[PDB]
Subunit: 155 residues, 12 copies
Amino acid sequence: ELLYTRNDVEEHVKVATIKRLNQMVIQFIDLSLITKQAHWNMRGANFVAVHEMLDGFRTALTDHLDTFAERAVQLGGVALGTAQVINDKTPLKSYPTNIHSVQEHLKALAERYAIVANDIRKAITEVEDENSADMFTAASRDLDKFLWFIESNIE
Amino acid sequence: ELLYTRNDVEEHVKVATIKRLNQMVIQFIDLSLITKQAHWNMRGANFVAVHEMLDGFRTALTDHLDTFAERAVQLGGVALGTAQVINDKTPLKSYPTNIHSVQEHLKALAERYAIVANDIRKAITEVEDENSADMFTAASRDLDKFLWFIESNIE
Amino acid sequence: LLYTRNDVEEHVKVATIKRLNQMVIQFIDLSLITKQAHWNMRGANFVAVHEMLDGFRTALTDHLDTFAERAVQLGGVALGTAQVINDKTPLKSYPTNIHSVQEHLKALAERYAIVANDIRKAITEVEDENSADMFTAASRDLDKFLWFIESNIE
Amino acid sequence: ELLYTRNDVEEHVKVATIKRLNQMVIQFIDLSLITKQAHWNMRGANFVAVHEMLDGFRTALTDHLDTFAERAVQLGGVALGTAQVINDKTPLKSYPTNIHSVQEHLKALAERYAIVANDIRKAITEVEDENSADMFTAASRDLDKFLWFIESNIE
Amino acid sequence: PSELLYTRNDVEEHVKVATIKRLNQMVIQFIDLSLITKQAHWNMRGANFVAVHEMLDGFRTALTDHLDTFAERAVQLGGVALGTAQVINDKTPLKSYPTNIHSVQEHLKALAERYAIVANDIRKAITEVEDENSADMFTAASRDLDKFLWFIESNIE
Amino acid sequence: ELLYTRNDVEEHVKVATIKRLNQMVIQFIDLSLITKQAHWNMRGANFVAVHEMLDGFRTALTDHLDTFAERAVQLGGVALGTAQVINDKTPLKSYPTNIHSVQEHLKALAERYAIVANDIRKAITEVEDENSADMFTAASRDLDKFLWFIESNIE
Amino acid sequence: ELLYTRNDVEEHVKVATIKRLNQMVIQFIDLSLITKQAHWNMRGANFVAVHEMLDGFRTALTDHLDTFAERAVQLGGVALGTAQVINDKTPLKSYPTNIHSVQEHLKALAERYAIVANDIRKAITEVEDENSADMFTAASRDLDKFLWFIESNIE
Amino acid sequence: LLYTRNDVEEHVKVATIKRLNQMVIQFIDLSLITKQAHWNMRGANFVAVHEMLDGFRTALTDHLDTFAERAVQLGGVALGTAQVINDKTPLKSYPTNIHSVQEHLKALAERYAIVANDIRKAITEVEDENSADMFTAASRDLDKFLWFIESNIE
Amino acid sequence: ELLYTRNDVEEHVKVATIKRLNQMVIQFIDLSLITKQAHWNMRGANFVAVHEMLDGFRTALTDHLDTFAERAVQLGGVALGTAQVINDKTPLKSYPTNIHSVQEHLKALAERYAIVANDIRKAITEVEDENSADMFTAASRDLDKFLWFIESNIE
Amino acid sequence: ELLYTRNDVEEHVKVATIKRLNQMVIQFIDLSLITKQAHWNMRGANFVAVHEMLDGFRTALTDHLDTFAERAVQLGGVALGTAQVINDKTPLKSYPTNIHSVQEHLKALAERYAIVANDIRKAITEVEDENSADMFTAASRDLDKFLWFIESNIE
Amino acid sequence: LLYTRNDVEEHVKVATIKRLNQMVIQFIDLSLITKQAHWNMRGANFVAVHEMLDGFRTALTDHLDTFAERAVQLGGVALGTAQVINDKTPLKSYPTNIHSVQEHLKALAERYAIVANDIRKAITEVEDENSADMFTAASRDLDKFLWFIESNIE
Amino acid sequence: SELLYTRNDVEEHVKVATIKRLNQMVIQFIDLSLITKQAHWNMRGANFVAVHEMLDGFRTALTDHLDTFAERAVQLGGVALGTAQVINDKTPLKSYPTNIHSVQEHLKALAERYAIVANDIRKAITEVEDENSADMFTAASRDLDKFLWFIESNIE
Ligand SMILES: [Zn+2]
Ligand SMILES: [Zn+2]
Ligand SMILES: [Zn+2]
Ligand SMILES: [Zn+2]
Ligand SMILES: [Zn+2]
Ligand SMILES: [Zn+2]
Ligand SMILES: [Zn+2]
Ligand SMILES: [Zn+2]
Ligand SMILES: [Zn+2]
Ligand SMILES: [Zn+2]
Ligand SMILES: [Zn+2]
Ligand SMILES: [Zn+2]
């Protein structure tokens, strides 16, 4: 069931939205862990700039997911973002540990960012909570631009 | 094994330290996630201040475990921070998914925070890399104070 | 309707303007009630909840100014006078004999909740695109505060 | 009835001074509304300077009126600023919702600002409370200046 | 066939080419508004000068910012953003701005005619485009544009 | 005994003002030791926001007192703020070092705050130096609002 | 002989007040010019700090200055800050030109600062306009500070 | 010319206004060009060159604006409409079919180099010190931007 | 003679420039006052914007002014900026005390800004000290802009 | 005897450490008051510079001060910062109230600074808590710098 | 040894100041070469590496400032004139005739690492705790810097 | 003739001459910069905390200045030299004393060297024939002459 709130968003609409929101949350938490992972372990040409870039990426991700979770609560549900749940519920493929060049990491990121980027863009139009829709549009715009930024550094 | 570098810390010392650094990166990433998890799902007496208090802790955690990972890297290791690795190598017990009182979260928070704070204070006297030890001490100081902040809010 | 190269049609100009004044009104009041509850609370969790509210006010203030200016943009008049608020406000008059933090949170709860429940249907009622956007940013903040308010209630 | 406070302003001075503070709250809140009303709905020569001048004022006014309300609550009284109390108790003539020229708005604004500026200048003499006096002086300094700005821009 | 650059970005091919198209038009209008805003800002005199003169440095920045947002989307959809002097010149729907005029009032009128055009094209653009990401961009812009038109109309005696 | 200055406040007015200033200095200095003393050792409900509130309190007390001292010196006197002088001359009840809960501390602080508050308010009108009257008013307003802040956090 | 203003203030208080405000406007202007004068032409021990100290004074001077003038105008009057009127109506002896030592310049500054300092102090309770009293008071504090600052660098 | 109390000799004014307008025209085109490169590059060194270029754009517009303002102070008309640039710029129409940073660098260099070599000469040609001063600063900027760009070329 | 300095700029250039510097200083100081004078006492159409506008000119002015006096000093001279010297040496025509409208002031200002602006423009070419030429050029660029701004608000 | 905390530093060391943390707490607070007291009653050559410098040491002392105190509390102890306690536990001699010359005050400050400074440099190696040792070195670093600034301004 | 009330042991003072001017000596020589390469590098990855070096320089300069002042604190004299760096620096002269980003990165790596490793063994070799903490902050930055420089090498 | 290639078309003889000048000014500026710190570290006596802080200000300006001269030399296709060996072998400044402590002592020693450097760059400003270079040298000279003035005005 749900936590009670004077917020009168339809009951069925609440359940489905928390549902999407959460999965969106999980995808973003993963994207933030791997952004760091790639960030630490790059090496080679274009290092520093691509290194800094990624830090930027981390923050916005963080902010966007935050909104997701808080919105899921507003509707009377329970936002999820614990290691066990992520590991258990991510669509994303585990990030490589054996890769080392900047281009390697860029390719690995591009891959992952794209799945979430494409997922969330579709979510924008299939979610019946306008607030989420506006939420989802805001994060779609950045993931897209981040997807572009990343791809754009592949040589 | 290790990646080359001009950094001349001894071979044995490097390897040992990479492992300590990494367990510490692993522990800080969970607390980090746990912190947020509690942040979103809290409700009741003293919510707003404790809610924002958690956002401060996170930034410091994040910021510390980042130094960790980078020291491991400087020593020619691979810093490890993906959901699958943390899930797999976490020393912390899964964070309750269905607790709601701020009080409830404070207590569940203290437990895990103490485990990490206690361990790292130990790590400090152990590690034989002056740098990592310095990092750890700065971290230890923050955790000890966070630990106390948490506990000091328990009714 | 005052003149403007703004080419939005008349009917939708007029219909939207009302909804915008209507909404201006609920916030100005909501704005007033927030500060009221701000000055006259005491008891547990005073300072933090007290400082919270100031934050809401500032946010409510800027959202409503966005509504008013759109109403003027579409060619009408934005109404913000005390008089107009007093008698077109759809919110129950705020109680002036309550003092405890909780009492106040509940009184805030109820009213924020009715404005936030109305602006969310509004998003999807107007046919002025820009206006649905304004509302949605406002709704997003409102629903956050409602959540913040109900989350401090014991 | 006054609420308990260790604060030892004489009981009579408390009740007297609270009533003055509220009356000042009342009209400053009224002037806050009037000021936004004028700056949304003006058009004509010197529009843009004047529209932003008024936002300057708005914030100064809401600042002082807070200082009054808090002094009221401090002396054990109850600050009154609900939509109902203002309309019922405002000494300011209602603002005309049928005027659009910058010039008309200035002239409608200079009359309502004068009453307040003059009320608050005299109230400085009248209050027994030193703190309230200082409060009113500070705020009278801003009223006299704004009033002067307002009139200076009339053609 | 597809004169589209490769990206891992789903958006269907048709929605891609049409939105790009759309994005580029808004781009061109916005750069033009930007050029003519500076244009009028430099050359205006008479009553209410410094206020209007500085009012226009504010709009410039926001146009620049939106336009930059419109260009970068196009390039994400895998297009080429076009904003060179030549493209603008024979692409702007905007009537060459008068260089023979000196009063704040006439500059206001001129500005208003052209702001109104851009103002109304981007408002339409919002429901016409099938990229949800672009309609969000356009609404943000449309909102500033609608505020800016009102600001200019308001300083006209 | 006074130090030369071209400042022309009458010999007698100086001496008395000076004595009055140092008293308010003495008791402002104490009040801040006490503000920190409570800051560190409070635990219980509402801990964090109460904790931070006081540090704000501590800053304000510090500028006011600093202003009082410099005025004494301006008049040609010596400002006294050595721990010896506070101890031997503070009219405030030594602060309890056994209490621990936030509530207990807030009560202890209310007592002491109200004393100094109720004194410096009397002082505004007792003092024959216009400048000193002003400092005291600025300071009294802060104390009167802090007392209220303290009292209002009391359950 | 005044300018229409809705600012009701007994017209005769108006006239008296404008004159005092103009006398302080004149004096503060002269002091500001004097201050730069010494600032520039200073040399000897303790140069750079005194020189920097003096810039500080100036910004305060001209700030107090401005409020005096804007108030004169507010009451229906004309603010007088012209080079001719400073020359013709200043009670201050023209600052010397032959001096160059910081010590010489501090003393020229002190004897002049004191004229103005001691003067506006009395002005405070001499004037019938309440806001002018608050103004003069704020400036009197600063003036008394700067004086004391100047005097304390004298060996 | 338009009247101003500004006593710069009439011919000087005419001459200077013209040269100012030539530089206003080139810096604008430069700035358009800078942004075109900005959106449309991909390949090695992207993120950094991308943001590098946003810096020049900012620099370019302040300077160009300083030139327009000077021309107007002298009684002339600052020109920066799309049509005038198109008709008077001496830079080759920028390619819209190129994609590599290394390509875009090469293109920016050609054009940047031209304008840079032309304002450097302008510093000593003009007979108005203020223009010459403002010309010298822009040149200094343009000479740094050209060395940055060239420097980034593999 | 000049104050001794290692600065080796030739002696005749020292004297010649010093005299030229003090000349700009005198003029700029006059402009400054005059600028503040119009800023206080104008009323009419376009008041607020023009009124704030004028405060900017002043900051700009006193900055350039400063740089001149110090250059003078560096070369071993005495910078003069006293009221008396301003009153005696000013090439600028005494400023009208009775004008009241924005246009009245604008025009009086235009006349005097233009006189100064035309002069310093020439001084750029007249003076043999490169440093002091840069100095004048910078001022010149502000002054022509300010004249332009002033003239551009005249109807 | 101690307060309950999950912090598992051993009881014995927890106790020794608190004791040592509090002694510094006491000494810093005292240097704090002393620093402020010299700041006020100083005059003579080099006044403004030294005056300002002391204002910087104060806030420095005050932060280390805080860091020591909470460490104490987070270890289960009570921090002790009360005028009474400073009186009774301070090892620093009373600071003289009869001295007036910057040069006199710098010598009185040096003595006491040097005492605390030399004491805490030893404390680093004595304490068995790494966190406090770190805590001490930072403040030690400041104290030494401050001792050198003080001494350096001596003639 | 200059008089101070700081009571470190005469012996420890003397030793510690000598180890402090050595860290001061190589840190100045490193900041010089840092700009030298900063200025004269070109090729792939120029801009970010140019600016990266600016960050490093600010850091080196602050650390070395710290060693200096400690040394004076113990009663010693700091040593940082051109002639002392030249006569006392361990590191090989930096190569004037190299231009590529890659040549420069490797030229810096070599020198940074020599200083990087010296000060890391210095931490354990000083008797002054205030110097060990000091050296340690430096080491941390220096080790990160060496990692940043090596990590850009293709 | 061994200049790095660039589309910057300043006359080639000018580039070589200007580069030599630019580099000579860089040498002096670094030495000043070195020396400044050296004094700021080792002074003691009356007026120490202000001269000390003052000096840190000088360092900052010198560094931004000398950095402009070098990026200039490099633009015209040269090599900017700033190595301890190059300052050492190529400097016009006398070796700064390491046995002075007094504030007045250090002020006098800086005064002389600041003087040396300040007076060269002022003349440089007229002797160079790349305009950007003189704008550069003029801005610097403005700071040096002011810094020199500050330093002299602190001598008792
Ligand atoms: Zn959050
Ligand atoms: Zn990192
Ligand atoms: Zn508004
Ligand atoms: Zn409030
Ligand atoms: Zn961009
Ligand atoms: Zn103070
Ligand atoms: Zn003013
Ligand atoms: Zn402009
Ligand atoms: Zn100055
Ligand atoms: Zn604290
Ligand atoms: Zn330093
Ligand atoms: Zn550089």
